[PDB]
Design a protein around this ligand. Structure first.
Ligand code: HEM
Ligand SMILES: NC(=[NH2+])NCCC[C@H](N)C(=O)O
Length: 238
């Protein structure tokens, strides 16, 4: 099992072994989201970390047959079970490494989509009936193990949208929809939540919230650009 709680991450690997770069990635990530001043903009992520509600996994690109998408599919099935028990506000953070000096943002985004595609082959459940399977559909979302997920890519190549620089690796952030229960967009609590996060972004990032955050074409939110560019709705790369 490559699904880890905070206390388990140190045993992922040591030195040049598979996952040997993971402990440091984990520390860098926790430093970013627990930072005092300015605070990390998403206080939900900070709270989740503080409360022990974040789990972690990794992909080691050097060893795709043993530390790659097949194993991550197992980790994600295990995570999904965990995420529906106990606290609603859990996240899985998946580091993809080793880090690649000099990678550009478009490169990390390509790697992200390729990984999502590779996972589809290892899904043991049918695609959910409530979500269209066609990625050009306005209501498409990425699904796995029987349900849609919220997922986004973090990268060190986010220079202006620093909120999405979580350390030196391409980093995937996975959540089941349960996380958002009680903070839907129409709700009083949901409007408060978005206010608070956005106020945080305005003290942290060099660029404001992206227009695609605002329902349709959620895929564009997975791989925000570092600027105000807006991708074509029917151009999801999956
Ligand atoms: C480690 C965990 C998390 C990280 C790293 C994280 C990161 C972010 C980032 C960077 C944003 C800014 C928008 C974007 O880039 O997509 C954001 C927004 C947001 N996040 Fe978090 N998040 C985490 C966990 C959570 C959890 C558990 C919840 C809910 C319970 C949550 C709810 C929200 C909401 C409501 C917004 C505001 C969206 C908007 O203003 O449109 N996040 N998060
Ligand atoms: N990192 C983020 N943008 N978080 C908020 C995700 C919003 C989510 N798709 C929803 O429908 O409630």
């Amino acid at each position: 099992s490559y699904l880890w709680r905070d206390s388990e991450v140190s045993r992922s690997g040591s030195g040049d072994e598979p996952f040997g770069w993971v402990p440091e990635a984990h520390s860098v990530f926790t430093e970013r989201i627990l930072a005092e001043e300015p605070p990390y903009p998403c206080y939900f992520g900070t709270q989740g970390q503080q409360r022990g509600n974040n789990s972690f996994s990794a992909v080691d690109t050097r060893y795709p047959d043993t530390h790659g998408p097949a194993a991550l599919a197992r980790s994600l099935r295990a995570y999904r079970q965990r995420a529906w028990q106990g606290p609603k506000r859990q996240t899985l953070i998946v580091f993809v490494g080793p880090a690649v000096p000099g990678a550009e943002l478009a490169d990390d985004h390509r790697r992200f989509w390729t990984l999502l595609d590779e996972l589809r082959a290892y899904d043991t459940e049918p695609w959910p009936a409530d979500v269209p399977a066609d990625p050009s559909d306005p209501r498409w979302q990425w699904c796995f193990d029987g349900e849609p997920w919220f997922i986004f890519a973090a990268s060190p190549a986010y220079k202006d949208r620093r909120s999405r620089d979580l350390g030196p690796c391409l980093t995937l952030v996975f959540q089941v929809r349960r996380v958002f229960e009680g903070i839907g967009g129409s709700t009083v609590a949901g409007k408060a939540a978005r206010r608070r996060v956005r106020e945080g972004l305005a003290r942290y990032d060099r660029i404001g919230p992206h227009p695609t955050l605002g329902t349709d074409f959620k895929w564009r939110q997975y791989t925000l650009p570092d600027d105000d560019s807006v991708a074509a709705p029917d151009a999801c790369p999956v």
